[PDB]
Design an enzyme around this catalytic site. Sequence first.
Site, PDB file in Angstrom:
ATOM      1  N   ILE A 153       0.802  -1.223   0.000  1.00  0.00           N
ATOM      2  CA  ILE A 153       0.000   0.000   0.000  1.00  0.00           C
ATOM      3  C   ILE A 153       0.842   1.284   0.000  1.00  0.00           C
ATOM      4  O   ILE A 153       0.728   2.083  -0.923  1.00  0.00           O
ATOM      5  CB  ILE A 153      -1.070   0.013   1.122  1.00  0.00           C
ATOM      6  N   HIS A 564      -9.445  -1.022 -28.762  1.00  0.00           N
ATOM      7  CA  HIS A 564      -8.570  -0.020 -29.322  1.00  0.00           C
ATOM      8  C   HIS A 564      -9.070   1.362 -28.955  1.00  0.00           C
ATOM      9  O   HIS A 564     -10.268   1.622 -28.987  1.00  0.00           O
ATOM     10  CB  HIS A 564      -8.516  -0.205 -30.846  1.00  0.00           C
TER      11      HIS A 564
HETATM   12  C1  LIG Z   1     -15.236   9.853 -33.175  1.00  0.00           C
HETATM   13  C2  LIG Z   1     -15.043   8.366 -33.331  1.00  0.00           C
HETATM   14  C3  LIG Z   1     -14.343   7.673 -32.342  1.00  0.00           C
HETATM   15  C4  LIG Z   1     -14.141   6.275 -32.458  1.00  0.00           C
HETATM   16  N1  LIG Z   1     -13.441   5.598 -31.475  1.00  0.00           N
HETATM   17  C5  LIG Z   1     -13.237   4.236 -31.578  1.00  0.00           C
HETATM   18  C6  LIG Z   1     -12.519   3.527 -30.571  1.00  0.00           C
HETATM   19  O1  LIG Z   1     -11.997   4.201 -29.433  1.00  0.00           O
HETATM   20  N2  LIG Z   1     -12.346   2.181 -30.732  1.00  0.00           N
HETATM   21  C7  LIG Z   1     -12.824   1.532 -31.794  1.00  0.00           C
HETATM   22  O2  LIG Z   1     -12.590   0.119 -31.858  1.00  0.00           O
HETATM   23  N3  LIG Z   1     -13.508   2.139 -32.762  1.00  0.00           N
HETATM   24  C8  LIG Z   1     -13.727   3.506 -32.692  1.00  0.00           C
HETATM   25  N4  LIG Z   1     -14.419   4.196 -33.666  1.00  0.00           N
HETATM   26  C9  LIG Z   1     -14.935   3.439 -34.791  1.00  0.00           C
HETATM   27  C10 LIG Z   1     -13.998   3.477 -36.019  1.00  0.00           C
HETATM   28  O3  LIG Z   1     -12.968   4.221 -36.066  1.00  0.00           O
HETATM   29  C11 LIG Z   1     -14.397   2.590 -37.190  1.00  0.00           C
HETATM   30  O4  LIG Z   1     -14.968   1.429 -36.673  1.00  0.00           O
HETATM   31  C12 LIG Z   1     -13.207   2.208 -38.067  1.00  0.00           C
HETATM   32  O5  LIG Z   1     -12.668   3.320 -38.685  1.00  0.00           O
HETATM   33  C13 LIG Z   1     -13.804   1.246 -39.111  1.00  0.00           C
HETATM   34  O6  LIG Z   1     -12.814   0.957 -40.054  1.00  0.00           O
HETATM   35  P1  LIG Z   1     -13.235   0.977 -41.593  1.00  0.00           P
HETATM   36  O7  LIG Z   1     -11.951   0.608 -42.389  1.00  0.00           O
HETATM   37  O8  LIG Z   1     -14.339  -0.018 -41.795  1.00  0.00           O
HETATM   38  O9  LIG Z   1     -13.805   2.409 -42.051  1.00  0.00           O
HETATM   39  P2  LIG Z   1     -12.945   3.754 -42.314  1.00  0.00           P
HETATM   40  O10 LIG Z   1     -11.879   3.859 -41.266  1.00  0.00           O
HETATM   41  O11 LIG Z   1     -13.875   4.970 -42.201  1.00  0.00           O
HETATM   42  O12 LIG Z   1     -12.241   3.715 -43.741  1.00  0.00           O
HETATM   43  C14 LIG Z   1     -12.940   3.902 -44.896  1.00  0.00           C
HETATM   44  C15 LIG Z   1     -12.075   4.682 -45.877  1.00  0.00           C
HETATM   45  O13 LIG Z   1     -12.451   4.455 -47.258  1.00  0.00           O
HETATM   46  C16 LIG Z   1     -12.622   5.748 -47.860  1.00  0.00           C
HETATM   47  N5  LIG Z   1     -13.525   5.684 -48.964  1.00  0.00           N
HETATM   48  C17 LIG Z   1     -14.857   5.764 -48.929  1.00  0.00           C
HETATM   49  N6  LIG Z   1     -15.352   5.646 -50.183  1.00  0.00           N
HETATM   50  C18 LIG Z   1     -14.320   5.479 -51.060  1.00  0.00           C
HETATM   51  C19 LIG Z   1     -14.173   5.289 -52.481  1.00  0.00           C
HETATM   52  N7  LIG Z   1     -15.298   5.241 -53.345  1.00  0.00           N
HETATM   53  N8  LIG Z   1     -12.946   5.148 -52.988  1.00  0.00           N
HETATM   54  C20 LIG Z   1     -11.852   5.178 -52.213  1.00  0.00           C
HETATM   55  N9  LIG Z   1     -11.932   5.352 -50.895  1.00  0.00           N
HETATM   56  C21 LIG Z   1     -13.138   5.501 -50.282  1.00  0.00           C
HETATM   57  C22 LIG Z   1     -13.095   6.591 -46.766  1.00  0.00           C
HETATM   58  O14 LIG Z   1     -12.879   7.989 -47.056  1.00  0.00           O
HETATM   59  C23 LIG Z   1     -12.273   6.153 -45.648  1.00  0.00           C
HETATM   60  O15 LIG Z   1     -10.995   6.796 -45.640  1.00  0.00           O
HETATM   61  C24 LIG Z   1     -14.644   5.565 -33.574  1.00  0.00           C
HETATM   62  C25 LIG Z   1     -15.360   6.273 -34.591  1.00  0.00           C
HETATM   63  C26 LIG Z   1     -15.553   7.669 -34.467  1.00  0.00           C
HETATM   64  C27 LIG Z   1     -16.328   8.449 -35.555  1.00  0.00           C
END
Ligand SMILES: Cc1cc2nc3c(=O)[nH]c(=O)nc-3n(CC(O)[C@H](O)[C@H](O)COP(=O)(O)OP(=O)(O)OC[C@H]3O[C@@H](n4cnc5c(N)ncnc54)[C@H](O)[C@@H]3O)c2cc1C
Lengths: 586, 586
Positions: A153, A564
């Site tokens: 402690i 994460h």
């Molecule tokens: C404020 C906030 C806080 C968060 N905190 C957490 C957390 O603490 N822990 C956690 O586990 N999750 C968290 N999340 C959730 C999170 O970050 C998402 O779950 C994660 O980003 C999902 O991954 P993704 O690859 O599916 O989507 P995304 O990360 O959004 O990636 C998609 C990408 O593809 C791009 N794209 C879209 N259309 C096209 C196209 N036609 N051509 C080329 N590129 C394109 C987009 O612009 C984007 O860059 C949080 C979300 C937010 C909004």
Amino acid sequence: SQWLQRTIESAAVIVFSKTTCPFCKKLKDVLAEAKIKHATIELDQLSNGSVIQKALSNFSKIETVPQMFVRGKFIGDSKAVLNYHNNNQLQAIVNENKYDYDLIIIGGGSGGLAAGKEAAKYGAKIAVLDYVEPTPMGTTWGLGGTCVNVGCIPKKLMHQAGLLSHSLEDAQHFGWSLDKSEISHDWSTMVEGVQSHIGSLNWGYKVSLRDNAVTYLNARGMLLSPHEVQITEKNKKVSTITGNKIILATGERPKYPEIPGAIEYGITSDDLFSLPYFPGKTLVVGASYVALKCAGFLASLGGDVTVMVRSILLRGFDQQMAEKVGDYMENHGVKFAKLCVPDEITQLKPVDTENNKPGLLLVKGHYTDGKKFEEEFETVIFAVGREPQLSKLNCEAVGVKLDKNGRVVCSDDEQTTVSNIYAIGDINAGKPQLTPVAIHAGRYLARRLFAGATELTDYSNVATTVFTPLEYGACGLSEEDAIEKYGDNDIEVYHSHFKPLEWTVAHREDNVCYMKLVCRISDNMRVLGLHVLGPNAGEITQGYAVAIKMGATKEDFDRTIGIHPTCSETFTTLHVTKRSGGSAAV
Amino acid sequence: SQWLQRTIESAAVIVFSKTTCPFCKKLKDVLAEAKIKHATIELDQLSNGSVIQKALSNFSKIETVPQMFVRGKFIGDSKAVLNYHNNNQLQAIVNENKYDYDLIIIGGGSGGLAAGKEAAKYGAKIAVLDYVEPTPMGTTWGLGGTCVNVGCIPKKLMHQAGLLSHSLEDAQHFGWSLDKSEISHDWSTMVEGVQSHIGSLNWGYKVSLRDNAVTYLNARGMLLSPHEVQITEKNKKVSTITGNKIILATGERPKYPEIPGAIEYGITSDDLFSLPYFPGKTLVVGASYVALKCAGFLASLGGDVTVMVRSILLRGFDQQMAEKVGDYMENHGVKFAKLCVPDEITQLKPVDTENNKPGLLLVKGHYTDGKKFEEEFETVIFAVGREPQLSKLNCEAVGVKLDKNGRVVCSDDEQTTVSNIYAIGDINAGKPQLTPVAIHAGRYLARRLFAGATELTDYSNVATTVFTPLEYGACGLSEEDAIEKYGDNDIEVYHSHFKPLEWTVAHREDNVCYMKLVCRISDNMRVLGLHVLGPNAGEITQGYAVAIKMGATKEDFDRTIGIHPTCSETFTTLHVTKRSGGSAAV
Ligand SMILES: Cc1cc2nc3c(=O)[nH]c(=O)nc-3n(CC(O)[C@H](O)[C@H](O)COP(=O)(O)OP(=O)(O)OC[C@H]3O[C@@H](n4cnc5c(N)ncnc54)[C@H](O)[C@@H]3O)c2cc1C
Ligand SMILES: Cc1cc2nc3c(=O)[nH]c(=O)nc-3n(CC(O)[C@H](O)[C@H](O)COP(=O)(O)OP(=O)(O)OC[C@H]3O[C@@H](n4cnc5c(N)ncnc54)[C@H](O)[C@@H]3O)c2cc1C
């Protein structure tokens, strides 16, 4: 079986029962009404209840339930006991005892009281003896033993004070307008806060014993015979109390090297946590986890700190991890005199007892090559281990076997070489010396003694954390132990450095935080050992201890999804093996 | 079986081998020297290896190892391959491909690049397409998607900035001479540090792909046919690339209420993490985890914050925990407008750009009883959910079915209604929308496609953490979901409040931190859900999620020794049940 014999003989009050017996309910009800505590075995819930049930007849002449026993004696079925209750004879019956106590616990630290409280649950009349022999300089403290007063402690609290130091540095980087260079730490303020909480813990322990109808005696105990314990109270009054079972839970006290000046001038961890003044320029002698924990927070509170190392850091611990813990501390203010031992301590200035300042000491020593060590320090702390003192207990003449280190030799059920005497905690030879281990063993044993339980404490894979400035959590085998045990070609180590998200903006180290999983290839990549160096390492490590208990494999970690962002999630995506020689950098 | 067929059909480059065959070692070494990446099935490590080895002759006409295949074609044994190598034909052979790419990933956030990097491991030629459409106020960013730029990373970093406030307060109690009340915080300085780190991550993501020989095109993707993708690059240049496999991984963007003023005057999280100025007096519309995470650190940074709650906090989470989370925030300065929705936003003052200050906005709304809402704010943040934007991908014409929420419908192997097109991450209907899920699912998918893996992603009991001022970590079922699923009489809930040791000296709340295990009685007290509210909830929860994946029971938790002193160890000694009516207080 013969389990029954032992169980009936050692239980204070025990009811044999079935959950589908309305007479059993009634019996339990009147005992609750009469506020009588007792063990209860529900035979229907045991795979061999039927066998036990029939076997009861050899003690009571009957095979029905409920059956109530008190100290080996059959008391009666439901109706018999209700008679005693209605007739005001039951209290006397349940209190009839050839000894003063069912259980006498010698030592009031973590183990003893945990055992006492648990035993009292099942009606065992219990006494806990606690006496704190003062340090050489006269330091003493209240109930709760090592952890509460001079261990876990106060350590963790001062550690945190140390960590808050780093947060003060870091806050500027997060937009806070704070000049760390006009902020000073006041040791006294810290020590008062700490001692305040300890005192609360002292009283907490007293009240807790009282609330469980456990008798607390502030007295030195000594064994006269297997059932006779001599007690010496504050008033130097000496008397004798008897008990059926005896638990030795006396813990250990810090060792002093046998060199001139050590006892007169040095202090130990026993003194540190109530020291009146900041230790100032400090030498820590030793290299155990206590040594480094103390060196670390003192450094973090801005002290000039040296650590004298005889051989290696954290003997018993994974040595790769030990080196990293040491390398971190060296890079953050702690100096190491490696391969060095102290020969004498001499006083240059006495403590300043009216301005609240330390004195000054001259420490002479030598390195292993014969080169002299000579340096001044305001405070010298010895953290060169801890030892039991069961000599004062009269163990051996009563028939309790001690090992070459003075520790009690016990079987896997905590039993000594004297049948009614048991030992738990630090004095139990070969067991991990941790507080929750003492408490756990204490509780399990009490259930075996007084409730007919059969579960043994499992001492394997007990997780630990070393609260150095960069914490080190560990569960299971060190890499080198696993290799020794299973051979190199059966061992796979997955590892990775990592950087806490918080360290990024604060501009702290890349590739200092580090974690690994030691695995047995032959056993479906079984997780043998988990190791992490990083912040909150204890909070990280704890959860995994359960999985490892359950026999977790590398696949079990892989199939689990991370949270994460955390440091901990890195365990779920490790893939770089040491064998591959691949880089473990971020 | 037909597993062998699928594997050879979709693998870019694959070697069938044994650990104990030196010609296999030989072959793998020349491939390595040639920097040719490939999958490897070591047959002597599969229980049906002997079957597969025979089955291979149906393709190669031979039953010995090694055997190598490129894109469905048998290339040869050890001698044939080495022959191509020495004829300088090996590179040409492994590069032959009817499409431009083995794999085209549309979207460069969490999942896409995880899948991309993973597929490149096994020799798959891969393009990752990422494009960021700017917010309505023109916020744009780099590679790494939501988490890296406008999600988890900036969110947690600012959370930390917020947490430092309490640290500063606490340090005073641990003896540090600092007056928190005279310490200011600068939004910009913080935002500079965060953006600097975000930028190094964009760069890290780019380099990572490059180092893995994955092609990255900063372009907007559109499906033209099941194998054709139209790309539009920064210069508005339009072209068409072909791929064998396509992965949609395009994520979601924040939604706005369809009310006047919303788009024009309000912002979302897409804008918050790079706002030039401090939000000021702020309305946060919404009550999901993002709403509360943002509202929380804004308050901790000395902001005047109000959260507008349509119905409840954290829909989908355990409502007892939700309420404790909210109560904690209200007690530390977050105002809540409960049962309230906004009707319009008016500008009273425009954003002051030459002074770099927010403007002023009038928000009008209404409560559920009809009573009006009218308040002024400098910033209105909408956190009312996220939506996919698969309109621009031309899914309908190509045959990729979406549900009513415009998310892609996928089978348990992530496959869409088009056989060679897969969907991972937030757009995959009915999956946990979290970063590590996207990554995990991406990596597993790439292995099934290109390395003959069979392992599906398990989406159950995915642990989460809400980084509110006091964090809430969870894994498995809520109490209400458990009770509803199994019946009240089959559900036992162990719980306890706790006080972090650190909070003692800091004089923080007694009995606010809180944990519980939701268990199923019929199933050996199986742990159905774990919940913890207190500091470092994510670090605490993570380890347990492996134990829960493994089927932990309450007895597994009980028989694990605690690490002391930690918050997490409280999980290994829970004994007070809700059913017993006993106090959960410390
Ligand atoms: C404020 C906030 C806080 C968060 N905190 C957490 C957390 O603490 N822990 C956690 O586990 N999750 C968290 N999340 C959730 C999170 O970050 C998402 O779950 C994660 O980003 C999902 O991954 P993704 O690859 O599916 O989507 P995304 O990360 O959004 O990636 C998609 C990408 O593809 C791009 N794209 C879209 N259309 C096209 C196209 N036609 N051509 C080329 N590129 C394109 C987009 O612009 C984007 O860059 C949080 C979300 C937010 C909004
Ligand atoms: C500096 C330091 C830091 C530590 N940090 C941690 C940590 O972070 N985590 C952890 O799990 N462990 C830690 N430990 C270890 C630890 O706290 C012990 O394992 C624990 O206290 C052992 O409990 P115990 O009941 O066996 O013995 P003790 O707690 O030492 O108590 C035994 C008591 O019996 C008394 N006694 C002795 N002789 C007699 C007698 N003849 N009659 C009556 N009473 C007697 C003693 O005075 C003592 O009060 C630390 C130890 C030290 C020294």
